[PDB]
């Protein structure tokens, strides 16, 4: 699809068999999801945004569907204002910015 | 890492 | 152009007579630039994201050139870690996300 930017680019994702809403975010290096349970071990990470840095849990090789497109990759879990699909998964679903 |  | 998302989508902008580098950010409602002077009136605003909120000055009806495309809109000025071009100006240059 072609997504214009007059509204927030919110899509449905599926992770852990559950549907959630998330923002397609070209300004984000990484994908950051609200507190949830994921399988496996995690590693520590800090990520920085407009108001400062937050600690997150890094889970690798997580199966996630984004607007119907399958991806398998790193998901960070922590106190984000909105679920964010960042470039690590936007590249897996073949997203580009065009103008 | 930058999330903005 | 078509911009892939393997790396951060950084472009050159011209704002207030100055060249700056900025990130094309579909996850941002607003355009936020590091400290600089701009003409006309302003009013204070708080804008948030990961890590919390920052205080900015809001200037309306500012002309910017984004990778050679002129647009007019609101620009927020304040201590952002990255210059970001948000949806309020991405729409005006006809930017879309495609996959
Ligand atoms: Cl759309
Ligand atoms: Cl648009
Ligand atoms: Cl200018
Ligand atoms: Cl003023
Ligand atoms: Na103005």
């Amino acid at each position: 699809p072609q997504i214009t930017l007059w509204k927030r680019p919110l899509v449905t994702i599926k992770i852990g068999g559950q549907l959630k809403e998330a923002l397609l975010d070209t300004g984000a290096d990484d994908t950051v999801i609200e507190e949830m349970s994921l399988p496996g071990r995690w590693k520590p990470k800090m990520v920085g945004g407009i108001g400062g840095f937050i600690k997150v849990r890094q889970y690798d090789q997580i199966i996630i569907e984004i607007a119907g497109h399958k991806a398998i990759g790193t998901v960070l879990v922590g106190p984000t204002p909105v679920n964010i699909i960042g470039r690590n998964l936007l590249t897996q679903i073949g997203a580009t910015l065009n103008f | 890492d930058q999330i903005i």
Side-chain angles (χ1 to χ4, degrees), chain A, chain B residues 3-4:
Chain A
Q2 185 161 82
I3 298 174
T4 60
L5 295 171
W6 302 100
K7 301 181 182 125
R8 292 181 175 157
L10 292 167
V11 301
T12 301
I13 69 170
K14 186 165 59 172
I15 184 169
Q18 26 203 34
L19 301 182
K20 299 171 191 267
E21 176 181 275
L23 185 65
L24 303 180
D25 189 352
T26 60
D29 298 342
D30 310 305
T31 293
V32 191
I33 308 288
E34 69 203 328
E35 177 64 40
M36 71 167 292
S37 169
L38 293 174
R41 292 183 59 87
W42 63 275
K43 291 166 2 153
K45 191 165 174 84
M46 275 190 9
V47 301
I50 207 165
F53 281 87
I54 61 168
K55 295 175 309 206
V56 299
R57 303 200 300 285
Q58 174 175 340
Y59 296 84
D60 292 325
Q61 220 175 314
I62 299 301
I63 302 170
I64 177 175
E65 198 178 82
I66 301 156
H69 296 249
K70 296 194 316 179
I72 309 177
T74 301
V75 174
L76 312 180
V77 177
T80 180
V82 67
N83 296 324
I84 292 157
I85 308 304
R87 294 189 298 97
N88 75 303
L89 300 183
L90 293 169
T91 57
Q92 287 201 22
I93 70 171
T96 57
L97 265 177
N98 294 258
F99 59 95
Chain B
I3 318 293
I4 38 253

